[PDB]
Enzyme design. Structure first.
Site, PDB file in Angstrom:
ATOM      1  N   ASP A 171      47.343  67.777  55.389  1.00 21.84           N
ATOM      2  CA  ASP A 171      46.215  67.390  55.754  1.00 21.84           C
ATOM      3  C   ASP A 171      46.086  65.714  55.840  1.00 21.84           C
ATOM      4  O   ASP A 171      47.239  65.181  55.553  1.00 21.84           O
ATOM      5  CB  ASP A 171      45.342  67.669  54.565  1.00 21.84           C
ATOM      6  N   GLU A 196      37.311  70.348  60.541  1.00 16.76           N
ATOM      7  CA  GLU A 196      38.719  70.611  60.102  1.00 16.76           C
ATOM      8  C   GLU A 196      39.611  71.177  61.029  1.00 16.76           C
ATOM      9  O   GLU A 196      40.694  70.951  60.707  1.00 16.76           O
ATOM     10  CB  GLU A 196      38.681  71.839  58.997  1.00 16.76           C
TER      11      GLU A 196
END
Ligand SMILES: Fc1cccc(I)c1
Length: 163
Positions: free
Chosen positions: A20, A11
Site C-alpha cells: 500500500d 483502492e
C-alpha cells in the site's frame, strides 16, 4: 454511486500481494494483510483470510468477498464507537460513505485525531470541516484521495468521483 463503488475507485483491484502507500503488504481492494516486513507473515494472513493456501494470489470473487467483509467491519466499528456513532448518524447517506471511506483507510485509531473535524461535521459546517480535514498527515500523504473524500463531505455529492 455507493460505498463499494467509491472505495473500489480509491483502492483499485490487485489479485496478488502488493504494498500500500505506507509500504504494507495488502491484496485485493485495499485489504491490509500485515504491517510486518515479512512477506511470509503476509501470506499466512492471506491464507487465514481466504481459507485456503493462496501462495499470495487470489481470485476476483475472493477479493470482492474480502472487500464486502472489510466495508461491513468499518461500518460496524463506527456503530460500536461512542465517539463516531453520533456523528455518523447525523450525516446524510453520501457523507456517511465519506466517513466509512476514512475509517476503511485509517481505522478507528487513525481517525481518533479528527475530533475537531468530527465536531464541525456534526455541526454541518461543511466548508470549515473541509479546511480542518486537510490539516492532516492523511491529506499530505494521500492528497488526491483525501481531496475526493473531503469534496464529498463538503458538498454531499458524488462530484469528485464522477469527475
Ligand atoms: F466514524 C465516523 C463518523 C463520522 C465521520 C467520520 I471521518 C467517521
Amino acid at each position: 454511486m455507493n460505498i463499494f463503488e467509491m472505495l473500489r475507485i480509491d483502492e483499485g483491484l490487485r489479485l496478488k500481494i502488493y504494498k500500500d502507500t505506507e509500504g504494507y503488504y495488502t491484496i485485493g481492494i485495499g485489504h491490509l494483510l500485515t504491517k510486518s516486513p515479512s512477506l511470509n507473515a503476509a501470506k499466512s494472513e492471506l491464507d487465514k483470510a481466504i481459507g485456503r493456501n493462496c501462495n499470495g494470489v487470489i481470485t476476483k470473487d475472493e477479493a470482492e468477498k474480502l472487500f464486502n467483509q472489510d466495508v461491513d467491519a468499518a461500518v460496524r466499528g463506527i456503530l460500536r464507537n461512542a465517539k463516531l456513532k453520533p456523528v455518523y448518524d447525523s450525516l446524510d447517506a453520501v457523507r456517511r460513505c465519506a466517513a466509512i471511506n476514512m475509517v476503511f483507510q485509517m481505522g478507528e485509531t487513525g481517525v481518533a485525531g479528527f475530533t475537531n473535524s468530527l465536531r464541525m461535521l456534526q455541526q454541518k459546517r461543511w466548508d470549515e470541516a473541509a479546511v480542518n480535514l486537510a490539516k492532516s498527515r492523511w491529506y499530505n500523504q494521500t492528497p488526491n484521495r483525501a481531496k475526493r473524500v473531503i469534496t464529498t463531505f463538503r458538498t454531499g455529492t458524488w462530484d469528485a468521483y464522477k469527475n
